[PDB]
């Protein structure tokens, strides 16, 4: 079939017409960022002339291949430790949470670290864990930090943003309780504290919700951590192929090489195995050139999610659909093998009203226009309120200022402006 | 059939007519004995990657040596996820990492001899927190920090022919 | 060391001319590694084959040197997107991306040129004496709960004041700083203090 963009909508445009949402909701969406690769390290002069003295005398006149190869594999496993010391490392120190969980009703024990587990890490974590899955020169270089140690950095990096917000990302962490951190997190988006307080119960109840959705969804299908999986299969088909590479006989009498030391005298040997080295020093340049290449892709993906966990949970962004759907809250970092996983907690609107509205009113042949909100009118009233969430007042001086007159505005109305 | 490695009593369920076997790579993996009805499974010598850990000559010629993905059993000795690591003492005490090795494990030279241990993340901090207190700062200072960026390379040509065919 | 990420860029390049260069010095089969001395030795029905040997070795060793630098220029040129990225949204302005412009609220940066590189300077603003107060989100004064217009509340002990989020700069409560929704049955921590009306 020809497939669907998506379904079609019309908005109700009207140079008199706003909608306004009178209700929210709280989004927490998962975004899979893989960090680092398998730091795997090739003894190009074993994969080629293992065992052998005559191959390796005729290896030597290809010159540095061998050594060029182990250097740039060796940058590349570097590399990979930096990537990660980049993302999670961004926290001098390691902050712990207080057995006191009076977080303002909102839940984190599902993200926080589990302490009677002998790894400390969360049941998120373990789930992401759990949702993924020789003797010929080539080896895996274990990484510079276990799994232990990124959960401390990420138990850390949530401890600070619960207790403290953003400032310990700033500077040294200054405890705030999470609802009026909260709370200013919402005046950040526009929206006033006050909705956050009249609806704590409500948000934290959805947050949870979230959570234990984000639980569900983890849980049933592993195809969310694909971009982590396909990570890993690409590497074992490059090594793969490679050891397969040492199967073939790229034009000589064989693929092995001692069988022909065993059957040919040198002045003939020397050319079968001329052949094999060719083809085999071929194939390990190919492995490292793809492998350096998906190195970059994944030093990209690993600055972005180091960006992310700096402007996302270390701060909060108004950058757009960089921190999730919606209008960002906050995040919270999970780890997972070789890579990331940030859950962003953001506002969504809900439930939204049609208002007929009015850039400015008239008064006494002046302009009053809203210091910050809309006038909107139901039918009979005329309001002014924030343009992210439905709280209408009375219109005032106090909420607007005065420019002009009457005669010049485009689309203004009447209405009253009360004077305390 | 030549090669090299160590012989072991086999648990491969051999069949009455099969000689020897073979791994994913298409090298040999287990025998049976020409003049015994008897299969012997070969594991490579043990093998492995060899590093040196050192501070600068500048300072000291003392270094340890890291041997890859082994047992301290072929080779003030140290194993670790990493391998067997020899001329460098295991100390308790966590430190920033100086030289790292892996699985945590880094090294450093101090008051002298050298030193792996198990690295540390940073200063524990835990955090007064309560859902009525807050910290407030009454002051401030200017902090100036550096980053470096590379920009651009050396704008380096090469002649393919003269370089091949000069 | 300051500077290593530059240095360190020149040092590869370096190798990758050198290495190159050192591959001239080998035979890759052949009977010598200088072309001279076999055209000055042999004929051409054979001088070819030996020529076509160093020819295969030089021309894959060209090869593996321009794909180095092209991944390395890749590399190169995301530091240098970067690095305009910065100079934009970090000396031409103020950022509120957090460590994107150094640890800290970013004031202002300054740029420096470098070898082969720039290096930025930024001025930020760090908290640095911290002192802990009683706080509350809401105050009640006759039923109705007061919140902050730009703020927040504190206690020092016995007195409540309103004072900006990142610098104690305590003042009185008044209806000029504050804003007025809803009453005291529905708030959470909310207290019970004096708004002075001017
Ligand atoms: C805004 O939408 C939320 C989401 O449905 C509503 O939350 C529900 O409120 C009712 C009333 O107490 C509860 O019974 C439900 O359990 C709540 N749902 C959740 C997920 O917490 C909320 O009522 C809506 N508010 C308005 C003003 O419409
Ligand atoms: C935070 O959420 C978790 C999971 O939703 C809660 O854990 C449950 O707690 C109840 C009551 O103690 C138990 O009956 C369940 O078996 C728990 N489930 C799991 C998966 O552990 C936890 O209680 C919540 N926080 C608080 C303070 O209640
Ligand atoms: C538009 O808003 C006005 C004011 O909020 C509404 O007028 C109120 O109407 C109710 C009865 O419906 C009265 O009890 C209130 O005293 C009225 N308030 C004021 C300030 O006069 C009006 O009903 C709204 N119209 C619609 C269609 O919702
Ligand atoms: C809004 O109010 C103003 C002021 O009362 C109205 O201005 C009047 O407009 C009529 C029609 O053009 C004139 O005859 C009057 O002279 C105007 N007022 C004055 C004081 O001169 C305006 O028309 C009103 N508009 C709406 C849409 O209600
Ligand atoms: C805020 O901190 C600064 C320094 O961090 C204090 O400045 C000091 O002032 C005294 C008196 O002039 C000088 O002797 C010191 O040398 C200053 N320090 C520095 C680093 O220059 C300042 O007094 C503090 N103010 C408050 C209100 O705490
Ligand atoms: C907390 O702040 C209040 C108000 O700033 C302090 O009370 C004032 O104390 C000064 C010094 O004795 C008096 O001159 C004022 O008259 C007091 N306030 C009023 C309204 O008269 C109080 O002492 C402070 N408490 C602490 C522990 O610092
Ligand atoms: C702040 O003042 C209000 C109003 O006096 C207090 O609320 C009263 O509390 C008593 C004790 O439970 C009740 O009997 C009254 O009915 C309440 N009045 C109202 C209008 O709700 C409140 O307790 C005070 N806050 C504190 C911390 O003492
Ligand atoms: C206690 C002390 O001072 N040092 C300890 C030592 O006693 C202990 O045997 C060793 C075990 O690895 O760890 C270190
Ligand atoms: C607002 O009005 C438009 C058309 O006037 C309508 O399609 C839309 O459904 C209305 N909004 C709501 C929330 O009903
Ligand atoms: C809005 O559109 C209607 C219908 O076209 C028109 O009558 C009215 O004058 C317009 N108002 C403004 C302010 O453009
Ligand atoms: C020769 O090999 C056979 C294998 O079955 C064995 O039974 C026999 O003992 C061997 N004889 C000698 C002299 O080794
Ligand atoms: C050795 O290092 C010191 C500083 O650590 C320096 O002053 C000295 O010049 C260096 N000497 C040599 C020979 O490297
Ligand atoms: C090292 O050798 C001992 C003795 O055979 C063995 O028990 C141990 O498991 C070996 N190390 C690892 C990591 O397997
Ligand atoms: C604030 O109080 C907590 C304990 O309640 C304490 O750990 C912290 O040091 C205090 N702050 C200062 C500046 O003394
Ligand atoms: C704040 O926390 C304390 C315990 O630390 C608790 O007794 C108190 O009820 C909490 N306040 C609210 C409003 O829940």
Not at chain 1, 16 to 44: G, Q, R, Y
Not at chain 1, 51 to 59: M, W
Not at chain 1, 176 to 201: D, W
Not at chain 2, 52 to 77: F, H, K, M, R, W
């Amino acid at each position: 079939y020809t497939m669907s963009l998506g379904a079609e909508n019309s908005v109700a445009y009207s140079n008199n017409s706003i909608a306004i949402p009178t209700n929210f909701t709280i989004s927490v969406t998962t975004e899979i960022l893989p960090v680092s690769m398998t730091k795997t390290s090739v003894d190009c002069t074993m994969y080629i002339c293992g065992d052998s003295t005559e191959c390796s005398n005729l290896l030597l006149q290809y010159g540095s291949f061998c050594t060029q190869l182990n250097r740039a594999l060796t940058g590349i496993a570097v590399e990979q430790d930096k990537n990660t010391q980049e993302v999670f490392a961004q926290v001098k120190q390691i902050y712990k949470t207080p057995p006191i969980k009076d977080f303002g009703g909102f839940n984190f024990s599902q993200i926080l670290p589990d302490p009677s587990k002998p790894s400390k890490r969360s049941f998120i974590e373990d789930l992401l864990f759990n949702k993924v899955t020789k003797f010929n020169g080539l080896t895996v270089l274990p990484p510079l930090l276990t799994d232990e140690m990124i959960a401390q950095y990420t138990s850390a990096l949530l401890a600070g943003t619960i207790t403290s917000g953003w400032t310990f990302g700033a500077g040294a962490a200054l405890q705030i309780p999470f609802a009026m951190q909260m709370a200013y997190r919402f005046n950040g988006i526009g929206v006033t504290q006050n909705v956050l307080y009249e609806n704590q119960k409500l948000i934290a109840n959805q947050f949870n919700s979230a959570i234990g959705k984000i639980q569900d969804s983890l849980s049933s299908t592993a195809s969310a951590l694909g971009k982590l999986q396909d990570v890993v299969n690409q590497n074992a088909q490059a090594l793969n192929t490679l050891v397969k590479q040492l199967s073939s006989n790229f034009g000589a009498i064989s693929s092995v090489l001692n069988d022909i030391l065993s059957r040919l005298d040198p002045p003939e040997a020397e050319v079968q195995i001329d052949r094999l080295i060719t083809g085999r020093l071929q194939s390990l340049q190919t492995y490292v050139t793809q492998q350096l290449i998906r190195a970059a892709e994944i030093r990209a993906s690993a600055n972005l999610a180091a960006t992310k966990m700096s402007e996302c949970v270390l701060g909060q962004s108004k950058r757009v659909d960089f921190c999730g759907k919606g209008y960002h809250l906050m995040s919270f970092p999970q780890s997972a093998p070789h890579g990331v996983v940030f859950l962003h907690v953001t506002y969504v609107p809900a439930q939204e009203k049609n208002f007929t509205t009015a850039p400015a009113i008239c008064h006494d042949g002046k302009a009053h226009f809203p210091r910050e909100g809309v006038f909107v009118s139901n039918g009979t009233h005329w309001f002014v309120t924030q343009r992210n969430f439905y709280e209408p007042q009375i219109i005032t001086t106090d909420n607007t200022f005065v420019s002009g007159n009457c005669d010049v505005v485009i689309g203004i109305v009447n209405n009253t402006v009360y004077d305390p | 059939l030549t090669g090299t490695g160590v012989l072991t009593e086999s648990n491969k369920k051999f069949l009455p007519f099969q000689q020897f076997g073979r791994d994913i790579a298409d090298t040999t993996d287990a025998v049976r004995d020409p003049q015994t009805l008897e299969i012997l499974d070969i594991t490579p010598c043990s093998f492995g990657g060899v590093s040196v850990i050192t501070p600068g000559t500048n300072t000291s010629n003392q270094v340890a040596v890291l041997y890859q993905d082994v047992n301290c059993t072929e080779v003030n000795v140290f194993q670790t996820r990493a391998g067997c690591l020899i001329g460098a003492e295991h100390v308790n005490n966590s430190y920033e990492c100086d030289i790292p090795i892996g699985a945590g494990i880094c090294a450093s030279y101090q008051t002298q001899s050298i030193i792996a241990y198990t690295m540390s993340l940073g200063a524990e901090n835990s955090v007064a927190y309560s859902n009525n207190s807050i910290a407030i700062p009454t002051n401030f200072t200017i902090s100036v920090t550096t980053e470096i960026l590379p920009v651009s390379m050396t704008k380096t040509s090469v002649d393919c022919t003269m370089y091949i065919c000069g």
